[PDB]
Enzyme design. Structure first.
Site, PDB file in Angstrom:
ATOM      1  N   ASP A   1     -44.919 -10.535  52.355  1.00 56.10           N
ATOM      2  CA  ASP A   1     -46.019  -9.483  52.213  1.00 56.10           C
ATOM      3  C   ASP A   1     -45.276  -8.114  52.146  1.00 56.10           C
ATOM      4  O   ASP A   1     -44.076  -8.283  51.958  1.00 56.10           O
ATOM      5  CB  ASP A   1     -46.754  -9.593  53.807  1.00 56.10           C
ATOM      6  CG  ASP A   1     -47.938  -8.467  53.785  1.00 56.10           C
ATOM      7  OD1 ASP A   1     -48.626  -8.210  52.955  1.00 56.10           O
ATOM      8  OD2 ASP A   1     -48.205  -8.294  54.981  1.00 56.10           O
TER       9      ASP A   1
ATOM     10  N   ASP B   1     -46.719  -4.966  53.287  1.00 56.61           N
ATOM     11  CA  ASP B   1     -46.730  -3.702  54.350  1.00 56.61           C
ATOM     12  C   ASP B   1     -46.363  -4.389  55.536  1.00 56.61           C
ATOM     13  O   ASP B   1     -46.611  -5.863  55.988  1.00 56.61           O
ATOM     14  CB  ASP B   1     -48.234  -3.314  54.641  1.00 56.61           C
ATOM     15  CG  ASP B   1     -48.460  -2.075  55.616  1.00 56.61           C
ATOM     16  OD1 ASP B   1     -47.892  -1.092  54.899  1.00 56.61           O
ATOM     17  OD2 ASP B   1     -49.032  -2.132  56.588  1.00 56.61           O
TER      18      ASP B   1
ATOM     19  N   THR C   1     -49.846  -9.543  48.346  1.00 56.91           N
ATOM     20  CA  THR C   1     -50.289  -8.375  49.071  1.00 56.91           C
ATOM     21  C   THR C   1     -51.640  -7.888  49.000  1.00 56.91           C
ATOM     22  O   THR C   1     -52.234  -7.839  47.927  1.00 56.91           O
ATOM     23  CB  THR C   1     -49.291  -7.126  48.937  1.00 56.91           C
ATOM     24  OG1 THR C   1     -49.683  -6.051  49.486  1.00 56.91           O
ATOM     25  CG2 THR C   1     -49.239  -6.799  47.455  1.00 56.91           C
ATOM     26  N   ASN C   2     -52.122  -7.358  50.401  1.00 53.28           N
ATOM     27  CA  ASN C   2     -53.560  -6.953  50.237  1.00 53.28           C
ATOM     28  C   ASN C   2     -53.115  -5.397  50.017  1.00 53.28           C
ATOM     29  O   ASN C   2     -52.866  -4.863  50.816  1.00 53.28           O
ATOM     30  CB  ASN C   2     -54.221  -7.106  51.621  1.00 53.28           C
ATOM     31  CG  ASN C   2     -54.913  -8.449  51.748  1.00 53.28           C
ATOM     32  OD1 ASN C   2     -54.834  -9.309  50.848  1.00 53.28           O
ATOM     33  ND2 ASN C   2     -55.550  -8.677  53.026  1.00 53.28           N
TER      34      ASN C   2
ATOM     35  N   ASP D   1     -46.803 -10.259  58.553  1.00 55.21           N
ATOM     36  CA  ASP D   1     -46.594  -9.567  59.662  1.00 55.21           C
ATOM     37  C   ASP D   1     -47.978  -9.626  60.621  1.00 55.21           C
ATOM     38  O   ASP D   1     -48.140  -9.302  61.594  1.00 55.21           O
ATOM     39  CB  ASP D   1     -46.221  -7.963  59.568  1.00 55.21           C
ATOM     40  CG  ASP D   1     -47.325  -7.106  58.969  1.00 55.21           C
ATOM     41  OD1 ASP D   1     -47.829  -7.650  57.949  1.00 55.21           O
ATOM     42  OD2 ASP D   1     -47.391  -5.983  59.359  1.00 55.21           O
TER      43      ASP D   1
ATOM     44  N   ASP E   1     -12.806   6.147  29.968  1.00 62.70           N
ATOM     45  CA  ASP E   1     -11.807   5.923  28.777  1.00 62.70           C
ATOM     46  C   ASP E   1     -11.902   6.737  27.601  1.00 62.70           C
ATOM     47  O   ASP E   1     -12.113   7.911  27.931  1.00 62.70           O
ATOM     48  CB  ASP E   1     -11.804   4.481  28.577  1.00 62.70           C
ATOM     49  CG  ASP E   1     -10.562   4.041  27.759  1.00 62.70           C
ATOM     50  OD1 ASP E   1      -9.565   3.617  28.311  1.00 62.70           O
ATOM     51  OD2 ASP E   1     -10.903   3.680  26.717  1.00 62.70           O
TER      52      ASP E   1
ATOM     53  N   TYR F   1       1.613   0.442  23.551  1.00 55.89           N
ATOM     54  CA  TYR F   1       0.750  -0.333  23.084  1.00 55.89           C
ATOM     55  C   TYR F   1      -0.183   0.521  21.909  1.00 55.89           C
ATOM     56  O   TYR F   1      -0.706   0.013  20.920  1.00 55.89           O
ATOM     57  CB  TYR F   1      -0.324  -0.853  23.874  1.00 55.89           C
ATOM     58  CG  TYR F   1      -1.016   0.265  24.885  1.00 55.89           C
ATOM     59  CD1 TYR F   1      -0.619   0.851  25.710  1.00 55.89           C
ATOM     60  CD2 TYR F   1      -2.448   0.260  24.153  1.00 55.89           C
ATOM     61  CE1 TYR F   1      -1.667   1.895  26.288  1.00 55.89           C
ATOM     62  CE2 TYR F   1      -3.524   1.341  24.838  1.00 55.89           C
ATOM     63  CZ  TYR F   1      -2.943   2.164  25.895  1.00 55.89           C
ATOM     64  OH  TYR F   1      -3.728   3.181  26.511  1.00 55.89           O
TER      65      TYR F   1
ATOM     66  N   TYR G   1      -8.184   5.336  17.994  1.00 53.69           N
ATOM     67  CA  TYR G   1      -6.809   5.434  18.024  1.00 53.69           C
ATOM     68  C   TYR G   1      -6.135   6.115  16.795  1.00 53.69           C
ATOM     69  O   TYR G   1      -4.708   6.399  16.989  1.00 53.69           O
ATOM     70  CB  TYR G   1      -6.172   4.237  18.649  1.00 53.69           C
ATOM     71  CG  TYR G   1      -6.500   3.657  19.944  1.00 53.69           C
ATOM     72  CD1 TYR G   1      -5.762   4.008  21.066  1.00 53.69           C
ATOM     73  CD2 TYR G   1      -7.491   2.619  20.165  1.00 53.69           C
ATOM     74  CE1 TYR G   1      -5.753   3.352  22.357  1.00 53.69           C
ATOM     75  CE2 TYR G   1      -7.708   2.172  21.329  1.00 53.69           C
ATOM     76  CZ  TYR G   1      -7.032   2.535  22.436  1.00 53.69           C
ATOM     77  OH  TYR G   1      -7.267   1.768  23.559  1.00 53.69           O
TER      78      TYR G   1
ATOM     79  N   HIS H   1      -8.359   0.209  35.871  1.00 52.48           N
ATOM     80  CA  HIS H   1      -8.804   0.677  34.871  1.00 52.48           C
ATOM     81  C   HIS H   1     -10.417   0.490  34.532  1.00 52.48           C
ATOM     82  O   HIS H   1     -11.081   1.320  34.119  1.00 52.48           O
ATOM     83  CB  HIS H   1      -8.060   0.223  33.587  1.00 52.48           C
ATOM     84  CG  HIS H   1      -8.575   0.917  32.193  1.00 52.48           C
ATOM     85  ND1 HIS H   1      -8.407   2.259  32.132  1.00 52.48           N
ATOM     86  CD2 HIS H   1      -9.382   0.441  31.401  1.00 52.48           C
ATOM     87  CE1 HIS H   1      -9.133   2.715  30.670  1.00 52.48           C
ATOM     88  NE2 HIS H   1      -9.461   1.515  30.343  1.00 52.48           N
TER      89      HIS H   1
HETATM   90  C1  LIG Z   1      -6.337   8.518  25.535  1.00 51.94           C
HETATM   91  C2  LIG Z   1      -5.984   7.165  25.610  1.00 51.94           C
HETATM   92  C3  LIG Z   1      -6.863   6.527  25.963  1.00 51.94           C
HETATM   93  C4  LIG Z   1      -6.730   5.076  26.367  1.00 51.94           C
HETATM   94  C5  LIG Z   1      -7.600   4.147  27.021  1.00 51.94           C
HETATM   95  C6  LIG Z   1      -7.217   2.734  26.512  1.00 51.94           C
HETATM   96  N1  LIG Z   1      -7.837   1.759  27.202  1.00 51.94           N
HETATM   97  C7  LIG Z   1      -7.695   0.441  26.440  1.00 51.94           C
HETATM   98  C8  LIG Z   1      -6.684  -0.300  27.180  1.00 51.94           C
HETATM   99  C9  LIG Z   1      -6.724  -0.304  28.530  1.00 51.94           C
HETATM  100  C10 LIG Z   1      -5.733  -1.244  29.399  1.00 51.94           C
HETATM  101  C11 LIG Z   1      -5.529  -2.404  28.866  1.00 51.94           C
HETATM  102  C12 LIG Z   1      -5.195  -2.590  27.042  1.00 51.94           C
HETATM  103  C13 LIG Z   1      -6.442  -1.365  26.473  1.00 51.94           C
HETATM  104  N2  LIG Z   1      -6.050   2.876  25.823  1.00 51.94           N
HETATM  105  N3  LIG Z   1      -5.818   4.330  25.269  1.00 51.94           N
HETATM  106  C14 LIG Z   1      -8.054   6.995  26.556  1.00 51.94           C
HETATM  107  C15 LIG Z   1      -8.186   8.113  26.307  1.00 51.94           C
HETATM  108  N4  LIG Z   1      -7.696   8.888  25.561  1.00 51.94           N
END
Ligand SMILES: c1cc(-c2cc(NCC3CCCCC3)n[nH]2)ccn1
Ligand SMILES: c1cc(-c2cc(NCC3CCCCC3)n[nH]2)ccn1
Lengths: 544, 544
Positions: free
Chosen positions: A8, A10, A119-120, A181, A331, A379, A462, A520
């Site tokens: 219900d 209320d 419900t009413n 109720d 990110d 990376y 990137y 992250h």
């Molecule tokens: C600069 C670098 C970054 C950045 C974030 C990111 N994330 C991706 C990454 C996270 C951890 C596992 C590998 C990929 N790489 N570079 C973000 C903003 N400005």
């Protein structure tokens, strides 16, 4: 064996019961006991209240009828009346969702139960009706069915409404738990063979409920904020230029809040924030950033430099007819939002970033020199050569997302010496275990989104280091003076909290948030905490 | 020969000039003449104002620098200063669009000219920046280019900005008219060979402009409200149930306003209202109703009864996270909105209908008896048999829309004895002339939309008479007590104004609008008048 649960509204899913205001008003106004409650039920099956509950008349038409009934009752009890509208406006306004009852219904549904609200209720045409509309919206989304007396033209305790309930549930009565109720409204369900629970205090009702279902409902952990079902969302598409369209998911009303994900993510990375922010009174626009999901992914590197990405987000606002939005990024999306604040402050109501700090360009160092310096950013050099990282990331999508989306203690990758080792996943499992942060179904959503365009557009974010550095140098004399929030994550080993330590020099009025034991993937790692920080900040610094 | 027109913002497209506040402030505060204007330009090419205009610093950083400059100037002139922020907040706030100048730019662009705004402006990070953001948004949409000094890092009168302007226009200088209120900023364009106009009063500048271009710009008629370019809109899609998705176009921020078209139309029938309502401070959602355009069109008759159409519109609101919307309908959409008000008042902020009256169900007469009675509704009996009207309407789409979309004096159809004659277009031309209400391009948009699903779903709206009558009888005891507007059209010979004569009996607080010399196609017949009525009503009875 039970497979359906009926609640219900209320006094069960919402408290205090609007019924329990006539009693309190009698007490507060020194009127004879039960005077208002007898005027409310006057005429019984053919009285004004039954007509209201069956949908024959609206609430604003019922108000004067309840008024005559109150006069008739005061005359009989030989008493003098000292506004029904004010009494009801205040009672409806005070009635809020019974969170532990809603939590129990959510758990039952998560365990395979069909859930419903029976419900009413009435057709509310009062000037203040939006409050109730908001309450019903919040509640109804969590249930399979909502059966309202004023829409079906039937009322509890009439036997027809119970037969109608069973027909909609597609269930025999013994398979159904019915919580109410009002004992009189419970009687016909019991007579039919349904399990019935009379609700006085919530805790006792939940003890009866967990006993009868065999599912733990009381003293239970969590749970996680409401998430998004992609097929249940409103999906929007805007062409920002001939070959570029941006997709977004939209939910809620109020000030526009634009959510900008990072690499390699989706609008869906904000799944725990979208319903929470919309419920908090905001119009959420969760983007698929350029290069991702249903947004366009042109192959050219230069299409992904910050100057063009920001220009496109301004065009996005222009096409939607929005003079401003609050911009919240994570990110790469976090880097984008700081640059929106620096280059387009007139379009940015407020800015927030998760994890990503604002660090100004160094005019005395090339971005490649700055990158090579910090071993954690290795990376990023691996991501430079077009095709190399695309091939590794696209080879097995399920493996890519399962390896990436992990909590801080589930670490399966070591981002130092990625180039030397020859890849992100070189010493990573072929079949990674599923992180506690994600379900198999959530991983498959990312896999499906990435099947369209792959990783070329995302990795191109990137590949504009020099271009972004030259553009950012134009802003070196500026400060960010619009409302701003920086949220650090204790255990993000790439975007470390310490990297944000000098931000007050550029953003003097900066507000902060900090999340402990958070890696992250902030939004999915600690969604309750993210929601708390963002809603508190939006309400104080962003508006409505 | 001219093919490009360039306008300055301050003192040209927007008035009064923000420049012309330092002069008025000096006068109002009895300060020495030119004291504030000299402090504003102090340092010239390397002063604080040039840094602001080039985008080196933001407006909030410039405020204290202008403050020191004012002190330095008051010291030299041996005078005592009695807040720069207050002066500028008020000046920017007072500056409004110069409507006749904007009208001239619109006409030049309609005649094939490339138009642009070239302006010395700043990065506005003030708490009040939204006002300026709104102004720039309104203006910019009407031009091919917007060149802002703070984004290009160049300022008028520097020669580089003029070369940049010519490069973006893709034009030689003699092909360009340049309009400015500052003679010094006009000098480099003249030196390059551009036609230059010094703007003091608007009328004189427009006389110079029409003389040099050969196009009538002053004392000109109309024009029509801004329309929509389908490819420039944000397009939204919501799945309301497994086989049904609704498409809509969305523009603006503020209270949600849901526009519901009639038969056989489109979201595009609101093209003149969408930009006007968004500019007025509303979030417009212009629907493709079920059976039309990009919305789903299931073949089943019962999918188009009012009870299901209304239920789906409630689901649409639920999925978008909207507790309410104001509902505005026309024709069949108008019938839908009155039923939304009667059955779902809690979800309807306010209701308006164009042409379509609210007439309650007659419980003592079958809908077919009621239809047969009025000779004008004969075409509706022709629409009953599945396939018959579909075949006639689908045979030639261009002919269908050209025959239908006509002004009251362009009458090509006679809806009496349609069954006897055997069709809508039996004694209608094969190649109708184009109505003055529509362009060939607008007709082709409807043709293209109708190629997807045809007329089955749209005609199904007429095939639920009995079903709709039974459902509407459930509401016979109700009144519509939420804010409501009825707009009658003098020359609609199907939905005549007199048919609305008894509405106050059901809607006691009803507000009205009436449009003279207006036929059935209200929105496109009299768009300026429709906009005026709706905006006035929304602002007084709907909110924000
Ligand atoms: C600069 C670098 C970054 C950045 C974030 C990111 N994330 C991706 C990454 C996270 C951890 C596992 C590998 C990929 N790489 N570079 C973000 C903003 N400005
Ligand atoms: C009842 C009838 C109608 C109605 C409107 C309409 N318009 C379509 C018609 C307009 C004139 C040309 C022929 C088509 N037909 N029936 C609308 C709402 N309730």
């Amino acid at each position: 064996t039970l497979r359906a649960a009926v609640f219900d509204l209320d006094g069960v899913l919402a408290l205090p019961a609007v019924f329990g205001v006539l009693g309190r008003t009698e007490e507060a106004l020194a009127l004879p006991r039960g005077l208002l409650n007898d005027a409310f039920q006057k005429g019984g099956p053919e009285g004004a209240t039954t007509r209201l509950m069956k949908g024959e008349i609206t609430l604003s038409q019922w108000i004067p009828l309840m008024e005559e009934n109150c006069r008739k009752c005061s005359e009989t009890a030989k008493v003098c009346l000292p506004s029904i509208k004010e009494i009801f406006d205040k009672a409806i306004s005070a009635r809020k969702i019974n969170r532990p009852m809603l939590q129990a219904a959510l758990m039952l549904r998560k365990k395979g139960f069909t859930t419903a609200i029976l419900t009413n209720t009435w057709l509310d045409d009062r000037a203040e009706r939006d409050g109730l509309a908001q309450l019903m919206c919040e509640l109804k989304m969590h249930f399979d069915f909502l059966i309202e007396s004023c829409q079906v033209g039937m009322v509890k305790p009439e036997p027809q409404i119970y037969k109608f309930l069973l027909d909609t549930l597609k269930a025999s009565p013994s398979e159904v738990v019915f919580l109410d109720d009002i004992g009189a409204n419970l009687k016909p369900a019991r007579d039919l063979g349904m399990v019935t629970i009379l609700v006085q205090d919530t805790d006792t009702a939940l003890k009866e409920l967990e006993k009868v279902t065999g599912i733990q409902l009381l003293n239970t952990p969590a749970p996680l904020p409401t998430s998004c079902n992609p097929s249940d969302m409103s999906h929007g598409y805007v062409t920002v230029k001939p070959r570029v369209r941006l997709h977004f998911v939209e939910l809620g009303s109020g000030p526009a809040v634009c959510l900008c994900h990072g690499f390699p993510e989706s609008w869906y990375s904000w799944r725990y924030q979208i319903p929470a922010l919309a419920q908090a009174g905001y119009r959420v626009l969760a983007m698929d950033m350029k290069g991702y999901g249903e947004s366009s992914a042109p192959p050219e590197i230069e299409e992904y430099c910050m100057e063009v990405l920001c220009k496109e987000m301004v065009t996005f606002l222009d096409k939607l007819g929005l003079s401003q939005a609050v911009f919240i990024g994570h990110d790469w999306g976090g880097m984008l939002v700081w640059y929106m604040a620096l280059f387009y402050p007139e379009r940015v109501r407020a800015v927030a970033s998760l994890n990503t700090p604002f660090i100004p360009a160094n005019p005395n160092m090339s971005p490649l020199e700055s990158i090579k310096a910090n071993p954690v950013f290795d990376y990023q050099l691996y991501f430079q050569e077009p095709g190399v990282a695309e091939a590794e990331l696209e080879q097995n999508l399920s493996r890519t997302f399962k390896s990436l989306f992990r909590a801080s203690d589930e670490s399966v990758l070591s981002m130092h010496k990625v180039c030397e080792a020859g890849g992100l996943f070189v010493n990573s499992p072929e079949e990674p275990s599923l992180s506690r942060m994600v379900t198999e179904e959530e991983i498959q959503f990312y896999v499906q989104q990435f099947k369209k365009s792959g990783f070329r557009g995302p990795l191109n974010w990137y590949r504009n280091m020099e271009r972004n550095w030259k553009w950012a140098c134009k802003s070196l004399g500026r400060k960010i003076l619009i409302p701003a929030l920086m949220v650090t994550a204790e255990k993000d080993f790439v975007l470390v909290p310490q990297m944000s330590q000098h931000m007050e020099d550029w953003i003097p009025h900066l507000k902060r948030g900090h999340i402990e034991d958070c890696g992250h993937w902030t939004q999915m790692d600690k969604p309750t905490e993210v929601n708390q920080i963002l809603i508190k900040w939006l309400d104080s610094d962003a508006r409505n």
